[PDB]
């Protein structure tokens, strides 16, 4: 039971008082402003100082070079500018404790979104992502409790997660909201009718802009795929996919037919001059896969569009003549 493990772990961290909540949110904003004034004093990027401070706080172990040489430059600064180093360090410590003390709130919000395709712990962890983004741009000066800003961010990160991960075949966000609107209406009219609706009446219930054909096609994408390992019958020796034919792999008869066709066309083209045959192979895409127009073929052979057309037409009625006598190519014709 990993849920009891995590709830016990977030249980060890006690909740924080309104005084502590103001103090931690204060040190966070002070640390973030201390970083920006270090980007003016030293001249390097915000995120660089951000990670070098995060490193030296949450863990010991380029590690020996780039990380320590940036920290070394920061350590070799005047006293008036090294204040902002210490302020940034404890400010990043405040961000850690601000997150840890409110992991208890993420669980209280995430539990309502269960049964939508993501497990509980997946509902807690994407919610924890909202808790981090909530802390990072939380400003305590507005005099609002941290729970109000977080709750909006926990729900944003969970809803966004369900929209992106729950479906096996990825679906846009608005369509997920649309599918939820459709799925809620069919359950209350099931209770009202005692039976499932037709597509016309659920479309009449959905409002304007919804007809019987749109509800059928949006519900069509709403359904999740079937498992190929769905068991068939009580016997434990067959899955669904054991009875599905391969519609894409060619059969032995199909594979031979395409080879006999390529062989019989080569033998047919061999009754022509090599230019006559090369023109036809360029015009039909047998060389590189694209039908070359009369201009490219004339450029290849150094002749005009009309000269190529005559070569092409003469080569065809020679093929038709030989085909009327051999009848090799008369089939393959579907």
């Amino acid at each position: 039971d990993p849920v009891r493990q995590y709830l016990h772990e977030i249980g060890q961290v006690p909740l924080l008082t309104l005084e502590e909540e103001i103090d931690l949110a204060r040190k966070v904003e002070e640390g973030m402003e201390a970083i920006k004034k270090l980007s003016e004093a030293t001249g390097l990027d915000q995120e660089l100082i951000r990670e070098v401070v995060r490193a030296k706080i949450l863990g010991t172990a380029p590690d020996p070079k780039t990380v320590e040489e940036v920290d070394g430059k920061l350590k070799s600064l005047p006293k008036e500018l090294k204040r902002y180093l210490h302020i940034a360090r404890e400010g990043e410590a405040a961000r850690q404790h601000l997150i840890e003390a409110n992991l208890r709130l993420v669980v209280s919000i995430a539990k309502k979104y269960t049964g939508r395709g993501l497990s509980f712990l997946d509902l807690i962890q994407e919610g924890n992502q909202g808790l981090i983004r909530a802390v990072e741009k939380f400003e305590y000066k507005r005099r609002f409790k941290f729970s109000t800003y977080a709750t909006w961010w926990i729900r944003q990160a969970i809803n966004r997660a369900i929209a992106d991960q729950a479906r096996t075949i990825r679906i846009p966000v608005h369509m997920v909201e649309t599918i939820n609107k459709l799925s809620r209406t069919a359950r209350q009219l099931q209770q009202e009718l005692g039976r499932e609706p037709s597509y016309e009446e659920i479309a009449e219930a959905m409002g304007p802009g919804w007809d019987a054909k749109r509800v059928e096609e949006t519900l069509k994408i709403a359904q999740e795929p079937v498992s190929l390992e769905t068991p068939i019958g009580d016997e434990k020796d067959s899955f669904y996919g054991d009875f599905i034919p391969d519609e894409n792999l060619p059969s032995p008869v199909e594979a031979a037919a395409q080879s006999l066709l390529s062989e019989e066309l080569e033998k047919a083209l061999s009754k022509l001059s090599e230019r006559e045959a090369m023109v036809l192979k360029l015009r039909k895409g047998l060389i590189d896969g694209r039908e070359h127009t009369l201009e490219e073929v004339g450029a290849y052979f150094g002749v005009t569009r009309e000269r190529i057309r005559q070569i092409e037409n003469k080569a065809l009625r020679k093929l038709k003549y030989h085909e009327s006598r051999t009848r090799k190519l008369r089939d393959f014709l579907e």
């Binding site: 030296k56 920290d71 350590k75 210490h86 360090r89 404890e90 410590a93 005099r143």
Partner: protein, 53 residues
């Protein structure tokens, strides 16, 4: 310091400040090193006996 400059305690004259009404007292098993001048050790790294503070 306070949220708005009006509620900020400004010292009206030269004096000595004391602290008295604490929400909570945190006793940490540690030992204390007062410093003058400046410091080179920064907040959060571990140290060995004899290392310069």
């Amino acid at each position: 310091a306070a949220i708005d400059p009006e509620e900020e305690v400004i010292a009206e004259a030269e004096g000595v400040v004391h602290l008295h009404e604490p929400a909570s007292i945190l006793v940490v098993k540690a030992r204390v090193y007062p410093f003058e001048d400046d410091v080179e050790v920064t907040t959060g790294d571990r140290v060995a006996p004899g290392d310069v503070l």
